[PDB]
Protein backbone atom coordinates (compact mmCIF):
# COMPACT_ATOMS: atom_id res chain seq x y z
CA UNK A 1 0.00 0.00 0.00
CA UNK A 2 1.22 3.50 -0.87
CA UNK A 3 1.66 6.28 1.70
CA UNK A 4 -1.85 7.56 2.50
CA UNK A 5 -1.20 11.22 1.56
CA UNK A 6 -0.03 12.36 -1.88
CA UNK A 7 1.31 15.92 -2.06
CA UNK A 8 1.34 17.11 -5.68
CA UNK A 9 4.28 19.49 -6.17
CA UNK A 10 6.15 18.96 -9.44
CA UNK A 11 9.69 19.82 -10.49
CA UNK A 12 8.80 23.42 -11.41
CA UNK A 13 6.62 24.93 -8.69
CA UNK A 14 6.39 28.18 -10.73
CA UNK A 15 4.77 26.33 -13.66
CA UNK A 16 1.23 26.98 -12.37
CA UNK A 17 2.00 30.40 -10.85
CA UNK A 18 -0.48 33.18 -11.76
CA UNK A 19 0.65 36.72 -12.65
CA UNK A 20 -0.83 38.47 -9.58
CA UNK A 21 0.31 35.85 -7.03
CA UNK A 22 3.53 34.82 -8.73
CA UNK A 23 5.54 34.06 -5.56
CA UNK A 24 2.67 32.46 -3.65
CA UNK A 25 3.48 28.84 -4.62
CA UNK A 26 7.00 29.36 -3.26
CA UNK A 27 5.76 30.56 0.14
CA UNK A 28 3.35 27.60 0.34
CA UNK A 29 5.90 24.91 -0.56
CA UNK A 30 8.44 26.50 1.80
CA UNK A 31 5.95 26.21 4.67
CA UNK A 32 4.99 22.62 3.81
CA UNK A 33 8.64 21.58 3.88
CA UNK A 34 9.52 23.22 7.20
CA UNK A 35 6.23 23.22 9.14
CA UNK A 36 3.99 20.39 7.93
CA UNK A 37 6.22 17.54 6.72
CA UNK A 38 9.24 17.14 9.11
CA UNK A 39 7.58 15.25 11.99
CA UNK A 40 6.10 12.72 9.51
CA UNK A 41 9.30 11.96 7.62
CA UNK A 42 13.05 11.35 7.72
CA UNK A 43 13.42 17.27 -0.60
CA UNK A 44 13.53 14.46 -3.16
CA UNK A 45 15.61 12.58 -0.54
CA UNK A 46 12.76 12.42 2.02
CA UNK A 47 11.46 9.12 3.40
CA UNK A 48 7.93 8.90 4.76
CA UNK A 49 5.37 6.22 5.55
CA UNK A 50 2.77 9.02 5.79
CA UNK A 51 3.10 11.15 2.65
CA UNK A 52 4.51 10.95 -0.87
CA UNK A 53 6.16 14.14 -2.21
CA UNK A 54 5.14 13.89 -5.87
CA UNK A 55 7.47 15.42 -8.46
CA UNK A 56 6.93 12.88 -11.28
CA UNK A 57 5.24 12.12 -13.50
CA UNK A 58 2.79 14.91 -14.33
CA UNK A 59 0.44 13.96 -17.19
CA UNK A 60 0.79 15.98 -20.36
CA UNK A 61 -2.60 17.60 -20.80
CA UNK A 62 -4.25 19.34 -23.71
CA UNK A 63 -7.65 20.45 -24.96
CA UNK A 64 -8.98 16.89 -24.80
CA UNK A 65 -8.20 16.63 -21.07
CA UNK A 66 -10.53 19.57 -20.39
CA UNK A 67 -13.51 18.87 -22.67
CA UNK A 68 -15.13 16.80 -19.91
CA UNK A 69 -16.42 20.21 -18.77
CA UNK A 70 -15.34 23.00 -21.12
CA UNK A 71 -16.50 23.93 -24.61
CA UNK A 72 -14.01 22.72 -27.21
CA UNK A 73 -13.98 26.01 -29.13
CA UNK A 74 -13.20 27.94 -25.94
CA UNK A 75 -10.37 25.52 -25.09
CA UNK A 76 -9.00 25.62 -28.64
CA UNK A 77 -8.97 29.43 -28.41
CA UNK A 78 -7.04 29.34 -25.10
CA UNK A 79 -4.57 26.91 -26.69
CA UNK A 80 -3.60 29.33 -29.49
CA UNK A 81 -4.40 32.77 -28.00
CA UNK A 82 -0.76 33.65 -27.26
CA UNK A 83 -0.05 33.52 -31.00
CA UNK A 84 -2.82 36.04 -31.76
CA UNK A 85 -1.46 39.35 -30.39
CA UNK A 86 1.66 41.04 -29.06
CA UNK A 87 2.73 41.67 -25.50
CA UNK A 88 1.21 44.98 -24.43
CA UNK A 89 3.99 47.54 -23.95
CA UNK A 90 2.02 50.79 -23.59
CA UNK A 91 7.72 45.16 -16.07
CA UNK A 92 5.62 42.38 -14.53
CA UNK A 93 6.42 38.72 -15.04
CA UNK A 94 3.96 36.93 -17.33
CA UNK A 95 2.85 40.23 -18.93
CA UNK A 96 -0.54 40.91 -20.51
CA UNK A 97 -1.15 40.54 -24.23
CA UNK A 98 -2.81 43.16 -26.40
CA UNK A 99 -6.59 42.54 -26.29
CA UNK A 100 -8.37 41.46 -29.47
CA UNK A 101 -12.10 41.44 -30.27
CA UNK A 102 -12.39 37.64 -30.17
CA UNK A 103 -11.58 37.68 -26.43
CA UNK A 104 -14.98 39.13 -25.54
CA UNK A 105 -17.13 36.10 -26.38
CA UNK A 106 -15.18 34.10 -23.79
CA UNK A 107 -14.85 36.71 -21.04
CA UNK A 108 -11.08 36.97 -21.63
CA UNK A 109 -11.11 40.65 -20.61
CA UNK A 110 -10.45 42.72 -17.48
CA UNK A 111 -9.15 40.42 -14.74
CA UNK A 112 -9.05 37.56 -17.30
CA UNK A 113 -6.81 39.32 -19.85
CA UNK A 114 -4.60 36.87 -21.80
CA UNK A 115 -0.92 36.89 -20.83
CA UNK A 116 2.26 35.13 -21.96
CA UNK A 117 2.40 31.65 -20.47
CA UNK A 118 -1.36 31.46 -19.89
CA UNK A 119 -1.82 28.11 -21.64
CA UNK A 120 1.27 26.66 -19.95
CA UNK A 121 -0.09 27.90 -16.60
CA UNK A 122 -3.47 26.31 -17.36
CA UNK A 123 -1.82 23.02 -18.37
CA UNK A 124 0.28 22.81 -15.20
CA UNK A 125 -2.80 23.53 -13.07
CA UNK A 126 -5.04 20.92 -14.72
CA UNK A 127 -2.20 18.39 -14.92
CA UNK A 128 -1.58 18.67 -11.18
CA UNK A 129 -5.22 18.38 -10.19
CA UNK A 130 -5.86 15.44 -12.55
CA UNK A 131 -2.78 13.67 -11.15
CA UNK A 132 -4.07 14.35 -7.62
CA UNK A 133 -7.43 12.75 -8.44
CA UNK A 134 -5.76 9.72 -10.04
CA UNK A 135 -3.48 9.10 -7.07
CA UNK A 136 -6.38 9.62 -4.65
CA UNK A 137 -8.42 6.86 -6.34
CA UNK A 138 -5.74 4.24 -5.58
CA UNK A 139 -6.45 1.81 -2.71
CA UNK A 140 -5.04 2.89 0.64
CA UNK A 141 -4.88 6.54 -0.42
CA UNK A 142 -6.55 8.86 2.11
CA UNK A 143 -5.82 12.32 0.71
CA UNK A 144 -4.28 14.10 -2.27
CA UNK A 145 -3.12 17.71 -1.91
CA UNK A 146 -2.69 20.15 -4.81
CA UNK A 147 -2.37 23.65 -3.36
CA UNK A 148 -1.71 25.00 -6.87
CA UNK A 149 -5.20 24.09 -8.10
CA UNK A 150 -8.61 25.52 -7.29
CA UNK A 151 -9.67 27.68 -10.28
CA UNK A 152 -13.29 27.63 -9.18
CA UNK A 153 -14.73 30.59 -11.18
CA UNK A 154 -14.20 29.24 -14.71
CA UNK A 155 -17.39 28.25 -16.54
CA UNK A 156 -18.10 25.98 -19.50
CA UNK A 157 -17.21 28.57 -22.14
CA UNK A 158 -16.20 31.72 -20.21
CA UNK A 159 -13.35 32.84 -17.98
CA UNK A 160 -13.89 34.73 -14.76
CA UNK A 161 -12.20 35.79 -11.52
CA UNK A 162 -8.67 35.01 -12.85
CA UNK A 163 -9.86 31.49 -13.81
CA UNK A 164 -9.64 30.05 -17.33
CA UNK A 165 -10.03 26.28 -16.93
CA UNK A 166 -11.93 24.91 -13.94
CA UNK A 167 -9.68 22.23 -12.51
CA UNK A 168 -12.06 21.79 -9.57
CA UNK A 169 -14.72 20.46 -11.96
CA UNK A 170 -12.23 18.41 -13.99
CA UNK A 171 -10.82 16.92 -10.80
CA UNK A 172 -14.29 16.05 -9.54
CA UNK A 173 -15.15 14.35 -12.84
CA UNK A 174 -11.86 12.43 -12.93
CA UNK A 175 -12.06 11.22 -9.32
CA UNK A 176 -15.71 10.19 -9.76
CA UNK A 177 -15.03 8.06 -12.84
CA UNK A 178 -12.28 6.16 -10.98
CA UNK A 179 -14.43 5.40 -7.92
CA UNK A 180 -16.74 2.39 -7.70
CA UNK A 181 -19.92 3.33 -9.55
CA UNK A 182 -21.80 1.90 -6.56
CA UNK A 183 -20.50 4.62 -4.20
CA UNK A 184 -19.08 7.71 -5.93
CA UNK A 185 -20.93 10.68 -4.43
CA UNK A 186 -18.78 13.81 -4.09
CA UNK A 187 -19.00 16.72 -1.65
CA UNK A 188 -17.25 19.93 -2.79
CA UNK A 189 -16.71 22.42 0.06
CA UNK A 190 -15.47 25.80 -1.18
CA UNK A 191 -14.18 28.10 1.61
CA UNK A 192 -12.50 30.66 -0.60
CA UNK A 193 -14.02 34.08 0.23
CA UNK A 194 -15.86 34.27 -3.11
CA UNK A 195 -18.77 32.27 -4.45
CA UNK A 196 -17.68 29.08 -6.19
CA UNK A 197 -19.91 29.95 -9.13
CA UNK A 198 -18.02 27.97 -11.78
CA UNK A 199 -18.08 24.70 -9.86
CA UNK A 200 -21.73 25.28 -8.94
CA UNK A 201 -22.66 25.84 -12.59
CA UNK A 202 -21.05 22.57 -13.64
CA UNK A 203 -23.16 20.50 -11.23
CA UNK A 204 -26.30 22.65 -10.93
CA UNK A 205 -28.55 19.87 -12.27
CA UNK A 206 -26.54 17.04 -10.72
CA UNK A 207 -27.55 15.01 -7.67
CA UNK A 208 -24.31 13.01 -7.36
CA UNK A 209 -22.05 16.05 -6.69
CA UNK A 210 -23.07 18.37 -3.84
CA UNK A 211 -21.44 21.81 -4.05
CA UNK A 212 -21.26 23.85 -0.84
CA UNK A 213 -19.82 27.37 -1.00
CA UNK A 214 -19.12 29.73 1.89
CA UNK A 215 -18.42 33.30 0.78
CA UNK A 216 -18.91 36.99 1.39
CA UNK A 217 -22.03 38.31 -0.33
CA UNK A 218 -23.47 41.75 -0.94
CA UNK A 219 -23.26 44.90 -2.99
CA UNK A 220 -19.88 45.22 -4.65
CA UNK A 221 -18.75 41.71 -3.68
CA UNK A 222 -17.54 39.63 -6.63
CA UNK A 223 -19.02 37.69 -8.31
CA UNK A 224 -22.47 38.81 -7.10
CA UNK A 225 -24.06 35.32 -7.06
CA UNK A 226 -24.49 32.64 -4.43
CA UNK A 227 -27.48 33.79 -2.42
CA UNK A 228 -29.14 31.35 -0.06
CA UNK A 229 -31.94 30.82 -2.61
CA UNK A 230 -29.63 29.08 -5.13
CA UNK A 231 -30.36 25.43 -4.33
CA UNK A 232 -29.97 23.70 -7.70
CA UNK A 233 -32.32 22.64 -10.50
CA UNK A 234 -33.93 19.45 -11.73
CA UNK A 235 -32.47 16.36 -10.10
CA UNK A 236 -29.93 18.77 -8.57
CA UNK A 237 -32.56 20.56 -6.48
CA UNK A 238 -31.25 20.41 -2.91
CA UNK A 239 -27.67 19.50 -3.96
CA UNK A 240 -26.42 23.09 -4.30
CA UNK A 241 -25.74 24.89 -1.01
CA UNK A 242 -24.59 28.45 -0.39
CA UNK A 243 -23.65 30.15 2.86
CA UNK A 244 -23.54 33.87 1.97
CA UNK A 245 -21.90 35.80 4.74
CA UNK A 246 -22.07 39.56 5.35
CA UNK A 247 -18.93 41.52 4.56
CA UNK A 248 -16.51 41.29 7.49
CA UNK A 249 -18.01 38.14 9.05
CA UNK A 250 -15.79 36.60 11.74
CA UNK A 251 -15.34 32.99 12.90
CA UNK A 252 -18.40 33.01 15.15
CA UNK A 253 -20.59 33.52 12.08
CA UNK A 254 -18.72 31.52 9.45
CA UNK A 255 -17.63 28.55 11.59
CA UNK A 256 -21.06 28.14 13.19
CA UNK A 257 -23.02 28.31 9.93
CA UNK A 258 -20.59 26.06 8.04
CA UNK A 259 -20.69 23.40 10.76
CA UNK A 260 -24.48 23.34 10.34
CA UNK A 261 -24.31 23.34 6.53
CA UNK A 262 -21.66 20.61 6.41
CA UNK A 263 -23.68 18.32 8.70
CA UNK A 264 -26.77 18.83 6.56
CA UNK A 265 -24.68 18.06 3.46
CA UNK A 266 -23.52 14.83 5.13
CA UNK A 267 -27.15 13.85 5.72
CA UNK A 268 -28.17 14.72 2.15
CA UNK A 269 -25.50 12.45 0.62
CA UNK A 270 -25.69 9.69 3.25
CA UNK A 271 -23.84 6.48 2.46
CA UNK A 272 -23.30 7.48 -1.16
CA UNK A 273 -20.54 9.88 -0.10
CA UNK A 274 -17.20 8.59 -1.37
CA UNK A 275 -15.00 11.70 -1.36
CA UNK A 276 -14.76 15.27 -0.10
CA UNK A 277 -13.20 17.86 -2.43
CA UNK A 278 -11.95 20.89 -0.48
CA UNK A 279 -11.40 24.23 -2.23
CA UNK A 280 -9.35 26.03 0.42
CA UNK A 281 -8.76 29.66 -0.48
CA UNK A 282 -6.97 31.77 2.11
CA UNK A 283 -8.57 35.01 0.92
CA UNK A 284 -11.32 34.50 3.53
CA UNK A 285 -8.73 35.31 6.21
CA UNK A 286 -8.76 38.71 7.88
CA UNK A 287 -6.50 41.26 6.21
CA UNK A 288 -6.90 40.01 2.66
CA UNK A 289 -7.04 42.79 0.03
CA UNK A 290 -9.55 41.03 -2.29
CA UNK A 291 -11.52 38.81 0.06
CA UNK A 292 -14.05 40.56 2.28
CA UNK A 293 -14.16 38.40 5.43
CA UNK A 294 -12.41 38.26 8.81
CA UNK A 295 -11.88 34.57 9.52
CA UNK A 296 -8.86 33.46 11.53
CA UNK A 297 -6.42 30.70 10.62
CA UNK A 298 -7.85 28.56 13.42
CA UNK A 299 -11.38 29.23 12.21
CA UNK A 300 -10.67 27.93 8.72
CA UNK A 301 -8.64 25.10 10.24
CA UNK A 302 -11.64 24.08 12.34
CA UNK A 303 -14.08 24.01 9.41
CA UNK A 304 -11.69 21.75 7.51
CA UNK A 305 -11.02 19.48 10.50
CA UNK A 306 -14.74 18.68 10.51
CA UNK A 307 -14.35 17.42 6.93
CA UNK A 308 -11.11 15.56 7.70
CA UNK A 309 -12.59 13.94 10.84
CA UNK A 310 -15.60 12.67 8.87
CA UNK A 311 -13.59 11.24 5.97
CA UNK A 312 -11.16 9.59 8.38
CA UNK A 313 -13.88 8.00 10.52
CA UNK A 314 -15.68 6.63 7.43
CA UNK A 315 -12.55 5.74 5.41
CA UNK A 316 -13.41 8.19 2.64
CA UNK A 317 -11.13 10.18 0.32
CA UNK A 318 -10.10 13.85 0.54
CA UNK A 319 -8.96 15.97 -2.43
CA UNK A 320 -7.50 19.23 -1.08
CA UNK A 321 -7.07 22.18 -3.44
CA UNK A 322 -6.07 25.81 -3.07
CA UNK A 323 -7.90 28.81 -4.56
CA UNK A 324 -7.68 32.56 -3.93
CA UNK A 325 -5.40 34.21 -1.37
CA UNK A 326 -3.69 37.57 -1.83
CA UNK A 327 -1.36 37.72 1.20
CA UNK A 328 1.46 35.23 0.62
CA UNK A 329 2.28 34.73 4.31
CA UNK A 330 -1.38 34.15 5.19
CA UNK A 331 -1.70 31.61 2.37
CA UNK A 332 1.38 29.71 3.57
CA UNK A 333 0.30 29.82 7.22
CA UNK A 334 -3.06 28.27 6.40
CA UNK A 335 -1.58 25.70 4.01
CA UNK A 336 0.97 24.66 6.62
CA UNK A 337 -1.55 23.95 9.37
CA UNK A 338 -4.17 22.34 7.11
CA UNK A 339 -1.55 20.10 5.50
CA UNK A 340 -0.17 19.12 8.92
CA UNK A 341 -3.73 18.25 9.98
CA UNK A 342 -4.12 15.97 6.95
CA UNK A 343 -0.78 14.28 7.69
CA UNK A 344 -1.59 13.84 11.38
CA UNK A 345 -5.01 12.52 10.38
CA UNK A 346 -3.60 9.99 7.91
CA UNK A 347 -0.91 8.77 10.31
CA UNK A 348 -3.46 8.23 13.07
CA UNK A 349 -5.69 6.23 10.71
CA UNK A 350 -2.89 3.82 9.79
CA UNK A 351 -2.19 3.34 13.52
CA UNK A 352 -5.90 2.64 14.12
CA UNK A 353 -6.23 5.65 16.43
CA UNK A 354 -9.51 7.49 17.00
CA UNK A 355 -7.91 10.87 17.71
CA UNK A 356 -6.68 12.26 14.40
CA UNK A 357 -5.05 15.61 15.19
CA UNK A 358 -2.66 14.70 17.99
CA UNK A 359 0.38 15.55 15.83
CA UNK A 360 -0.78 18.95 14.54
CA UNK A 361 -1.43 22.03 16.67
CA UNK A 362 -4.97 23.41 16.80
CA UNK A 363 -4.37 27.14 16.30
CA UNK A 364 -7.71 27.88 17.97
CA UNK A 365 -6.15 27.08 21.35
CA UNK A 366 -2.38 26.83 20.77
CA UNK A 367 -1.66 30.55 20.35
CA UNK A 368 2.14 30.24 20.42
CA UNK A 369 3.03 28.06 17.44
CA UNK A 370 6.17 29.51 15.88
CA UNK A 371 6.88 29.98 12.21
CA UNK A 372 9.87 27.64 11.70
CA UNK A 373 13.14 29.56 11.57
CA UNK A 374 14.29 27.24 8.78
CA UNK A 375 11.67 28.67 6.39
CA UNK A 376 13.32 30.35 3.42
CA UNK A 377 10.80 33.21 3.82
CA UNK A 378 11.00 33.33 7.64
CA UNK A 379 11.78 37.05 7.84
CA UNK A 380 8.51 37.90 6.04
CA UNK A 381 6.40 36.61 8.95
CA UNK A 382 7.02 39.56 11.30
CA UNK A 383 6.38 41.29 13.51
CA UNK A 384 5.67 38.21 15.66
CA UNK A 385 6.46 35.10 13.59
CA UNK A 386 3.57 32.97 14.88
CA UNK A 387 1.61 30.62 12.61
CA UNK A 388 -1.72 32.36 13.31
CA UNK A 389 -0.55 35.94 12.69
CA UNK A 390 -2.70 37.85 10.19
CA UNK A 391 -2.60 41.43 8.89
CA UNK A 392 -4.91 43.99 10.50
CA UNK A 393 -8.51 43.71 9.38
CA UNK A 394 -9.36 45.49 6.13
CA UNK A 395 -13.14 45.54 6.67
CA UNK A 396 -14.74 45.92 10.07
CA UNK A 397 -15.39 42.75 12.05
CA UNK A 398 -18.96 41.45 12.29
CA UNK A 399 -19.99 39.14 15.12
CA UNK A 400 -23.78 39.13 14.63
CA UNK A 401 -26.13 38.88 11.67
CA UNK A 402 -28.24 42.03 10.89
C1 LIG B 1 -19.09 40.38 -12.48
N2 LIG B 1 -18.49 41.45 -11.70
C3 LIG B 1 -17.46 42.26 -12.11
C4 LIG B 1 -17.11 43.13 -11.12
C5 LIG B 1 -16.03 44.16 -11.19
N6 LIG B 1 -14.75 43.48 -11.01
C7 LIG B 1 -14.27 43.45 -9.63
C8 LIG B 1 -13.54 42.15 -9.30
C9 LIG B 1 -12.64 42.33 -8.07
C10 LIG B 1 -11.31 41.59 -8.20
N11 LIG B 1 -11.49 40.28 -8.84
C12 LIG B 1 -11.39 39.11 -8.18
N13 LIG B 1 -11.54 37.99 -8.91
C14 LIG B 1 -11.37 36.84 -8.25
C15 LIG B 1 -11.07 36.77 -6.89
C16 LIG B 1 -10.99 35.49 -6.12
O17 LIG B 1 -10.21 35.35 -5.18
N18 LIG B 1 -11.89 34.57 -6.48
O19 LIG B 1 -12.09 33.41 -5.72
C20 LIG B 1 -10.95 38.00 -6.26
N21 LIG B 1 -11.12 39.17 -6.87
C22 LIG B 1 -11.99 40.37 -10.22
C23 LIG B 1 -12.71 41.69 -10.48
C24 LIG B 1 -17.98 42.84 -10.01
C25 LIG B 1 -18.13 43.37 -8.73
C26 LIG B 1 -19.10 42.86 -7.88
C27 LIG B 1 -19.94 41.84 -8.30
C28 LIG B 1 -19.81 41.29 -9.57
C29 LIG B 1 -18.83 41.80 -10.41
K1 LIG C 1 -16.41 29.99 -1.59
K1 LIG D 1 -25.20 19.70 -7.44
ZN1 LIG E 1 -11.49 34.16 -3.89
Q: Please give the full DSSP string across 195-263, using - where no structure is assigned.
A: --HHHHHHTTT-SSEEEEEEEE-STT-TT----TT----GGGTTSEEEEEE-TTBBHHHHHHHHHHHHH
Composition of the chain by helix, strand, coil, percent to 5: 40, 15, 50
Paired sense of beta strands 240-245 and 51-54, if any: unpaired
CA of 352 relative to ligand 4 center, distance in Å: 37
Give yes or no: 11 in active site.
no
How many domains does the chain divide into?
Answer: 1
Q: How was this structure determined?
A: X-ray
Judge contact between 76 and 30, C-beta under 8 A.
no
The answer to whether the CB of 161 is under 6 A from ligand 1 is yes
Q: Is residue 271 part of a domain?
A: yes
Contact 81, 104 (CB under 8 A): no
Residue 172's CATH number = 3.40.800.20
Distance 214 CA to ligand 2 centre (A): 4
In a domain, 397, yes or no: no
**Contact indicator for 326, 288 with CB cutoff of 8 Å:** yes
Asked whether 311 and 318 are in contact (CB, 8 A), the reply is: yes
Distances (CA, A) of 248 to 33, 93, 108, 316: 32, 32, 30, 34
| Selection from 143, 127, 117, 281 nearest residue 199 by Cα | 281
- Helix 72-80 / helix 118-136 crossing angle, nearest 10 deg: 130
283 lines ligand 1 (CB under 6 A): yes
Neighbours of ion ligand 4 (CB under 5 A): 192-194, 281, 283, 324
Domain that holds residue 259: 5-380
The distance from CA 109 to its chain's CA centroid, rounded to whole angstroms, is 24
Q: Specify if 138 maps to a domain.
A: yes
Nearest to 245 by CA among 194, 307, 304: 194
Mutate to test the pocket of ligand 1, among 20, 151, 222, 324 (most ligand atoms within 8 A of CB): 222
Does 88 fall in a domain?
yes
β-sheet with 143-146: strand ranges across: 51-54, 5-8, 143-146, 317-321, 273-279, 185-190, 209-216, 240-245
Any domain includes 400: no
How buried is 210 (Cβ within 10 angstroms: 0-12 exposed, 13-18 middle, 19+ buried)?
Answer: buried
Going by C-alpha positions, the residue among 216, 322, 232, 236 that lies closest to residue 278 is 322
3-state secondary structure of 273: strand
Q: CA-CA-CA-CA torsion for 38, 42, 47, 51, nearest 10 degrees?
A: -30
Residue 282 burial by Cβ neighbours in a 10 Å radius (0-12, 13-18, 19+): buried
Q: Do residues 97 and 88 make contact, with C-beta atoms less than 8 angstroms apart?
A: yes
Amino acid sequence: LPPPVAIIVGHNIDASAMPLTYERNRFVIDMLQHYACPVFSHMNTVSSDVFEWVLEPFPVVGVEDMTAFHDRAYLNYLSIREALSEVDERLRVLPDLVPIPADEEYGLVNENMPFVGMWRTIQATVSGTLLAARLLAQPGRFAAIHWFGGRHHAKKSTAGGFCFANDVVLGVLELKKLLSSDKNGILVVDVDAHHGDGTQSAFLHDNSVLTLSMHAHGVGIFPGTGGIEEIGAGLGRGFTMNVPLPEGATDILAVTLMYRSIHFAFKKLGEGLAAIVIVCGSDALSGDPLGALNLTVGGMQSIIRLLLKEAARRSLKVLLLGAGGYVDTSCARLAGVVTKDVLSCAAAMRLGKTEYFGDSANLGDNLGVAVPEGCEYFTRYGPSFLMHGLPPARVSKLYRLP
